[PDB]
Amino acid sequence: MDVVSLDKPFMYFEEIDNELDYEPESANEVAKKLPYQGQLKLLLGELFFLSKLQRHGILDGATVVYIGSAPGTHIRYLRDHFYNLGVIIKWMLIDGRHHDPILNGLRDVTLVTRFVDEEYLRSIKKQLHPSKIILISDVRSPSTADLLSNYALQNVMISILNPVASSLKWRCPFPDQWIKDFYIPHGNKMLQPFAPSYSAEMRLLSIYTGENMRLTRVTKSDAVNYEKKMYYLNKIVRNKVVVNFDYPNQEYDYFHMYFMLRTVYCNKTFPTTKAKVLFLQQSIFRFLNIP
Amino acid sequence: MDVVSLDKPFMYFEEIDNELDYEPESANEVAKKLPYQGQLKLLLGELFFLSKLQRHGILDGATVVYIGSAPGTHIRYLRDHFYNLGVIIKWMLIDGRHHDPILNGLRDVTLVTRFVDEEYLRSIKKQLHPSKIILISDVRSPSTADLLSNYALQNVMISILNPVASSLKWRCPFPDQWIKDFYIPHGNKMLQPFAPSYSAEMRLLSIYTGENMRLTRVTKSDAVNYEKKMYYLNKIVRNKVVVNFDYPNQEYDYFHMYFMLRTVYCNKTFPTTKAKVLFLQQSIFRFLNIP
Numbered sequence: 131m132d133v134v135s136l137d138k139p140f141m142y143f144e145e146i147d148n149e150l151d152y153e154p155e156s157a158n159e160v161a162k163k164l165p166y167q168g169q170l171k172l173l174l175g176e177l178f179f180l181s182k183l184q185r186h187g188i189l190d191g192a193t194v195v196y197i198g199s200a201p202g203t204h205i206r207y208l209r210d211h212f213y214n215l216g217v218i219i220k221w222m223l224i225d226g227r228h229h230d231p232i233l234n235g236l237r238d239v240t241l242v243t244r245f246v247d248e249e250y251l252r253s254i255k256k257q258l259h260p261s262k263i264i265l266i267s268d269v270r271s272p273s274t275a276d277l278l279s280n281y282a283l284q285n286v287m288i289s290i291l292n293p294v295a296s297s298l299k300w301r302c303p304f305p306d307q308w309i310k311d312f313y314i315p316h317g318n319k320m321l322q323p324f325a326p327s328y329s330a331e332m333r334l335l336s337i338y339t340g341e342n343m344r345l346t347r348v349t350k351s352d353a354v355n356y357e358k359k360m361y362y363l364n365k366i367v368r369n370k371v372v373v374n375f376d377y378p379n380q381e382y383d384y385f386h387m388y389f390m391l392r393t394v395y396c397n398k399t400f401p402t403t404k405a406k407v408l409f410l411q412q413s414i415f416r417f418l419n420i421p
Numbered sequence: 422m423d424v425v426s427l428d429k430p431f432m433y434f435e436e437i438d439n440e441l442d443y444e445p446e447s448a449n450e451v452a453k454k455l456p457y458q459g460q461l462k463l464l465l466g467e468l469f470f471l472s473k474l475q476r477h478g479i480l481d482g483a484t485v486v487y488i489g490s491a492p493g494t495h496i497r498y499l500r501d502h503f504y505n506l507g508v509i510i511k512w513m514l515i516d517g518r519h520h521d522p523i524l525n526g527l528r529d530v531t532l533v534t535r536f537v538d539e540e541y542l543r544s545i546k547k548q549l550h551p552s553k554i555i556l557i558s559d560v561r562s563p564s565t566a567d568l569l570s571n572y573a574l575q576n577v578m579i580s581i582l583n584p585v586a587s588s589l590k591w592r593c594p595f596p597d598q599w600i601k602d603f604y605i606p607h608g609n610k611m612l613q614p615f616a617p618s619y620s621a622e623m624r625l626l627s628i629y630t631g632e633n634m635r636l637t638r639v640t641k642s643d644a645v646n647y648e649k650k651m652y653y654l655n656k657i658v659r660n661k662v663v664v665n666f667d668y669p670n671q672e673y674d675y676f677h678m679y680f681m682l683r684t685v686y687c688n689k690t691f692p693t694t695k696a697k698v699l700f701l702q703q704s705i706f707r708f709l710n711i712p
């Protein structure tokens with residue numbers, strides 16, 4: 131067995147303290163080991179992001195504009211969690227595909243079947259006015275050309291919507307498929323437990339202060355670094371059994387999930403963080419029908 | 422006579438401490454009172470900007486890419502000034518129009534007759550590599566649509582060229598002709614002595630640290646402020662005779678010119694700042710054939 135003792139898991143990209151040469155054969159390896167693993171991946175990251183905003187007092191009264199939301203099964207859980215905590219939020223889910231019917235019939239949630247373009251972004255901005263907007267983007271085109279186009283759309287979402295905070299999908303294109311350097315918004319590069327086995331995708335979390343928008347350039351050399359750090363995390367780290375983690379499941383991803391879930395607020399009072407987490411995880415797995 | 426005592430002139434937009442309702446009749450007022458006033462306006466601002474970079478140690482060894490440089494008569498003075506100070510700089514002047522023949526025959530200055538597009542920007546970036554670039558932009562299309570397009574080109578100049586510093590033309594569109602909010606790079610809004618009588622144009626000066634690029638949003642309310650502050654400066658301030666300014670010409674623009682020129686480095690040693698400034702001004706006026 132692949133055992134180890136860890137104090138904490140890597141929460142952000144910057145924390146990854148080692149790298150490995152990406153082995154292209156890894157793309158043939160089993161990408162997922164849990165049913166509905168993708169909805170779980172999204173649910174944990176968005177619960178993490180939103181709980182943070184609540185902590186900063188910027189969630190209540192906001193309209194959450196989620197682009198690339200369909201099917202959105204896991205979003206039903208997110209909505210219920212904050213709704214039951216008393217937080218007042220309007221959800222606007224936009225995708226060209228249809229949403230899971232469990233999302234219908236909620237006065238606080240608007241479903242839109244539209245592929246967004248800059249022009250459409252302008253109209254919903256005028257229509258949302260004057261509510262404070264929190265943007266969550268998970269749009270999908272993929273080629274380096276596809277990626278760049280997605281990142282270009284995400285930056286236009288921020289400039290037109292002018293959100294108070296944002297969570298953006300972020301996967302650096304492969305250095306060997308580099309087209310040109312580009313800019314992404316400045317934010318925390320949140321690592322994702324239950325991401326596919328060899329995925330180099332993270333979520334870019336930003337909170338907007340003042341009327342400024344800080345961007346950061348991404349070069350091919352950055353692309354090489356992303357690839358090696360993420361490869362090391364996926365191949366080595368995520369395959370560890372954290373033996374000093376006293377929890378029903380000790381695999382790295384559960385240890386990592388524990389640290390995100392410990393930041394989530396509940397109405398129920400627990401004697402320990404472990405009890406709250408086991409509770410939230412049990413709850414999340416039951417909702418998603420994950421054994 | 423319109424007299425006053427001033428400690429210093431307004432050097433930056435932010436310093437303007439008063440406003441006035443813009444009177445559209447001002448557009449019919451004499452815009453210039455000096456021959457070649459526009460070359461003088463540009464020369465002082467660029468001497469100011471470049472001397473700053475020299476002071477920060479980022480001028481020497483840089484390639485200055487000036488887009489919208491033609492005719493560029495005043496640029497001959499700038500080039501000579503730094504060349505004679507021993508600073509090593511390459512100049513690359515690009516415009517679709519032709520440059521003043523006084524700019525030919527200098528091994529350190531390359532003249533290009535081309536209207537720049539993003540694609541062309543990419544090629545010169547690859548060709549300049551690996552020199553450090555200092556961008557100066559004075560491109561001209563004007564409608565609010567024209568302005569926006571110019572500002573859009575200027576931001577693309579920064580992302581492709583990735584300069585260590587930049588001076589960009591900046592005039593906020595009129596609030597009553599607003600089209601949409603947009604972003605300009607963050608920088609100092611340098612005020613311009615000898616700008617046309619009622620011009621609201623300033624120069625945006627930025628120095629790029631790290632791999633970050635900070636932008637700032639400009640809204641219609643900002644547009645109203647720009648208009649009123651600049652109108653107050655033009656109508657009231659620039660029409661003052663600074664009587665406590667012991668200098669051959671006491672008009673505000675000369676008082677303002679004095680503060681920019683006092684920051685310029687010379688080989689010659691002077692007993693006072695006043696002597697250096699009178700010298701630089703005499704020199705500048707003789708070069709431009711201004712009486």
Ligand SMILES: Nc1ncnc2c1ncn2[C@@H]1O[C@H](CSCC[C@H](N)C(=O)O)[C@@H](O)[C@H]1O
Nearest residue numbers: 198199200201202225226245246268269270
């Ligand atoms: N321009 C656009 N506007 C809206 N959705 C878009 C888009 N282009 C792509 N997308 C959407 O991006 C999605 C990526 S998969 C997203 C899954 C979703 N985040 C979840 O909660 O289940 C697809 O459903 C796709 O239609």
Ligand SMILES: Nc1ncnc2c1ncn2[C@@H]1O[C@H](CSCC[C@H](N)C(=O)O)[C@@H](O)[C@H]1O
Nearest residue numbers: 489490491492493516517536537559560561
């Ligand atoms: N795409 C582009 N590339 C190059 N120059 C451009 C441009 N579009 C406009 N311009 C130029 O912008 C200039 C504005 S007037 C500039 C005067 C100049 N700064 C001086 O030193 O004298 C014009 O000469 C015009 O041709």
